[PDB]
Each structure stands twice: as C-alpha cells, then as structure tokens.
C-alpha cells in the first residue's frame, strides 16, 4: 500500500491599494475667487483569499456520487454627477 | 493502506488600503472669497480569508451522495451629487 | 490502516485600512470669506475569516446523503448629496 | 503502489495599485477668478487568490461520477457627468 | 508503480498599476479667468490569482466519470460626459 501527499506553502505577499499618498491644497493669496472641488470620489477596495482554500478530504470508496456549484458575483456600480459651480469676482 | 497527508501553511503577509497618508490646506491670506470641497466621498473595504477554509472531512463511504452548493455574492452602489455651489468676490 | 492526516497552519498577518494618516487644516489670515467642506462620507470597513473555517470532520458512513448550501451575501449602498454651498465676501 | 506528490510553493510577491503619489495644487496670486475640479472619480481595485485555491483531495474509487461547475462573474460599472461649469471675471 | 510527483514553484514577483505619480498644478498669477477640469475618470484595476490554482488530486478509479465546467467573465463598462463649461473675461 502507501500514499503520501505534502503541501508546504509559504505565503510572504504584499497586496496594496492607495498605500502611500500625500496631498496638498497651498499658498492662495489671490485676492480674486478661488474654487476647488477635490476629489468627488475616492474609492479603494481589497479583495484577497476569497472563494474555498486549504481544504482536506479524504474521501475512499467504489461507487461514489458529487455535484459541486461554485459561485462568486462581485458587482459595482459608481454612479456621479456635478452641477452648476459659479465663479465670480467683481 | 496506510494513507499520509499533510498540509504546513506559514502564513506572513500584508493586505492594506490606505495605510500611510499625509494631508493639508493651508496658507490663505488672499482677501478673496475661497471655497474648497475637499474629498466627499472616500471609501476604503478590505475582505479577507472568506467562504470555507483549512477544513478536514474524512469520510469513507462506498456509495456516498455530496451534493454542495456554494454563493458569494459581493455588491457595492455609489452614488454622489454636488449639484449647486456659488462663490462671489465684491 | 492507519490513516494519518495532519494540517499545521500559523498565521501573521497585518490587514489595515486607513490605519495611519496625518490630516490637518491650517494658516487662514486672508480677511476674506473662507468656506471649507471636508469629507463629508468617509468609511473604512474590514471583513476577516468569515463563513466556515477549521472545522473537522470524522464521518464514516457506507451509504450516507449529504447536502449542503452556503450563501455569504454582501451589499452596500452608499448616497451622497451636496445640494446647497454658497460663499460671499463683501 | 507507493505514490508520493509533494508540492513546494513559496510565495513573495508585491501587488499594488496607486501604491505612491505626490498630488498638489499651489501658488494662486493672480486676483483673476480661478476654477479647479480635481480628479472628479478615482477608483482603485485589488483582487487576488480568488476561486479555488491549495485543496486536496485523496478519493480513490472503483466507479466513481463527479461533477463540477465554476462560475465568476465581475462586473464594474462607472457612470460620470460634469454638467454646468461657470467662471467669469469682471 | 513508485509514482513520484514534485511541483516546486518559487515566486518574485512585482505586478504594479500607477505605482509612483508626481502630480501638479502650480504657479497660477495670470489676472484673467483660469479653468481646470483635471483627470474626469481614473481608474486602476488589478487582478491575479483568479479561478482554480495549486489543487491535488488522488483519484485512482477503474472506470470513473468526471464531468467539469469552469467560466470567468469579466465586464467593465465606463461612460463619462462633459457638456458645458463658460470661462468668460472682461
């Protein structure tokens, strides 16, 4: 007889998503109008290891039956709308 | 029979959105109307490790039935609207 | 027999949304109408080790039926509105 | 018999989006009316290790029926309007 | 038989989008109406590791029936409008 099956896995990864960032609004001395709208919107999303992993079986036997169904559905949706931004010096 | 197995999993990493960041608004001696709309929406999601993991079944069966099922159904909707902003100097 | 089965698993693992962040607003000697609006919608969410994990199983059965259904349904909706800003100086 | 699988993997990887980003707006002394709208929608997406992934199994049958569906559906949608911008000077 | 299978796989490796970015606007003192609509939609997207990586199978069986399906599906769609921008001077 005899059977022998060995996983070593070794996991060191670095998954990242807007890690690191700077971000200045300086100096304004205009004296006339000034607008800013920065950034309406700032999404990040991260996803990791999902679904089925590391999973064992042992499963011996002549006439057996299975029926797997696996699924996985990521929906988004960003929706946006900017409108009447007025200005005005003198 | 005399059936091994084995699974050694060593796990060392990093999953990150947004770690380090620097932010500022600064120096306004204009005299002059400012309006400034700074990041209106910001999201950060991280998901790990989800659904099945690391499970052991040992199950000798000679006429065995398995049905399974499994869904992972992930959804995110944004909405953002800026409609109206006025800025006037003299 | 004499069926073995061995699953050694360790983990180390950093998982962080928007952990470190130096956010200031600063320096307004202008005399002039200054109107600021800062994130208004900021949200950091993180999901781990969820639905089914290290669970073990001894099932020995002949002629055995197992059904199984598993559903994680995730949904988020997010809505934002900045309708109305209005900044004047003299 | 004597069957043996080993399976060894190590694993050291860097995955990133928008990892590092310098972002300013500066020095506005003109006295002239000024409109800026910044980046309006950034979204950043990270997924990985998804599915199915580091399972075993150990199922040694005479006459054996399995049966198997694997279904991923990732749909992003991204919808942006800038309607009515106005900037008058004088 | 002495059936002996090895699968030693080691990986470096750095998969990156917009990973280091210098962005700016700087040095505005013109006196007449200045208008900026920066990036309108940025997005960044990264995938791996996707669908079924690194399973074992021990299934010796006479005469066994497998039947397998496996489909990904990946739809990004993205719409953007920018219908009306005045800068008037004098």
Same mark, same amino acid.
């Given at each position: &007889?005899?059977?022998?099956? #060995?996983?070593?896995?070794?996991?060191?990864?670095? *998954?990242?998503?807007? @890690? !690191? +960032?700077?971000?200045?609004?300086? %100096?304004? $001395?205009? !004296?006339? +109008?000034?607008?800013? *709208?920065?950034? $309406?919107?700032?999404?990040?999303? *991260?996803?990791?290891? @999902? &679904?089925?992993?590391?999973? #064992? %079986? %042992?499963? $011996?036997?002549?006439?057996?039956?299975?029926?797997?169904?696996?699924?996985?559905?990521?929906?988004?949706?960003?929706?946006?709308? #900017? !409108?009447?931004?007025?200005? #005005?010096? %003198?």
């Amino acid at each position: &007889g005899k059977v022998q099956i #060995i996983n070593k896995k070794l996991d060191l990864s670095n *998954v990242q998503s807007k @890690c !690191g +960032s700077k971000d200045n609004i300086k %100096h304004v $001395p205009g !004296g006339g +109008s000034v607008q800013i *709208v920065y950034k $309406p919107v700032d999404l990040s999303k *991260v996803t990791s290891k @999902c &679904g089925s992993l590391g999973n #064992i %079986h %042992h499963k $011996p036997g002549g006439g057996q039956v299975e029926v797997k169904s696996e699924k996985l559905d990521f929906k988004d949706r960003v929706q946006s709308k #900017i !409108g009447s931004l007025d200005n #005005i010096t %003198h």
